[PDB]
Amino acid sequence: MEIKAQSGSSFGASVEGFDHTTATAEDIKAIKETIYTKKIAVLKGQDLTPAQYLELGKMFGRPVVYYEPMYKHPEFEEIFVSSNVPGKQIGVPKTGKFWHADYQFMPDPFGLTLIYPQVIPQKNRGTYYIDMGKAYERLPQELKDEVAGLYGVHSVRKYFKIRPHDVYRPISEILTEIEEHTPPVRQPLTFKHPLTGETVLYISEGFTVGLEDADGKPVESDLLQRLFEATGQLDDTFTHENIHLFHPEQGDLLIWDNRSLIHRALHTTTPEPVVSFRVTVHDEHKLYDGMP
């Protein structure tokens, strides 16, 4: 197994010759260290059944089942399915078309996200990424001092997806279910990365709905929108310097840093088939050390 860096960038790395059935424990830790510093590792030539995909994921941590069963793979609930291939729909079509970190709206977010594309359109398909640790460092000192001591408030209520059994329900009832089952969760606005020690600005346009001070009082300023602006999350041209665009190819298996990165899906505006399998695992740490 050989880990190779990406051409002309310190973001991302490739992993060639990886076979999870033969990979040593030293191999796994070498890939882990690549993930936490290069932010994303792309395993090449992966041809795995769902069961073998889950076993590869289990070598990197403890899987977390997505809270909403509509997304589940029918045979392995640990697999999250993004698919637009029906007469009945399996999984959910074109998930994640918004800036977010995974489970940012949940009380205990996991450290590693695995994405295993199954069907890839040739054009206009990919994933955008922003390193929110590097995005914090590139903030002006004004914003650096403003975010200190604050807390982010994160909720799924913006991009919660209507389910088949929601038809004919009054929309207020759904909003109440969202607040009861998935209430807004608080996290420190910045935290120390438990593995690299860098400072991460933990916000995303999709899930972060507001800010609060240490005592839980909401922040009245437009600081949150200015943080979205400065980190590049409001540039709908996706040319901002913080933004990386990656195009997976057949055989790729992505494992990236769910603490440092926010991401957003690039899909076609067509019914062309596109399928991706997701597995999400807790590593050896929570979001940050000493998390209450």
Next chain:
Amino acid sequence: MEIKAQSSSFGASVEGFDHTTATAEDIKAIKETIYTKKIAVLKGQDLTPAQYLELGKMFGRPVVYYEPMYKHPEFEEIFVSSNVPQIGVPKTGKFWHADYQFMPDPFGLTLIYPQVIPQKNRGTYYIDMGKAYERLPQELKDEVAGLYGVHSVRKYFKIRPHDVYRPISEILTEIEEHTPPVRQPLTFKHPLTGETVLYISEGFTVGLEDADGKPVESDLLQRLFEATGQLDDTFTHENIHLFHPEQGDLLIWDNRSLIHRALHTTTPEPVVSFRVTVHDEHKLYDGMPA
């Protein structure tokens, strides 16, 4: 044709009405009864969808419901409430509301023609919001003068089959653009009877506003909901009437004075109702802004 009260100042039954042979004086006698007794029950009606629409046109200009999901397949003027898998929409109106209260130009008359009446009767609750105002304590009447009601469909908008897999915030945005909130005076003079109507409903009224347009941050709206009997989940409040229809009934009621809601019990049996909504020579009140 004969009009009789039902021995209760709420409600009247109309016997011997045939819309194919009724005269203009019959129609006007029924209209006068609707604005006074608040609901007129036409007995022994036997109508196809087309004949039902012809009947409704004798009472005014029909309004087509804005959301096409509720439309009857061959007559768009007919609003279909059905739990039979699918034309119409199931489990409709399980909340106090006046029809089109969330719209800028509410109509005065609502017609309901049940198609499938189970033996487990599926009736309708009613509250006369004119009498609800008169029974308010004087200080509550004082709090109400000069205010405005803000009405929106955003709470009981029903998810449609083409909404599946959409993010919920996009539907809320679509609701705001197509059917934004609408202001009406908190009370108004009934343009047919002259009485004062407290024009609120738990289902559609989302807030109150100052005479200047400033939101009323008090809990007056909730206290108005409670005082008019809209928060009584036992349906025992003295303002509440439970009407039970029988086979040939056709209901026409005052959509200005009355609020209504469906039964609390979940229906197991098939039940279908055809609704026609109609403008009646007057707007919500005389002197509405254009």
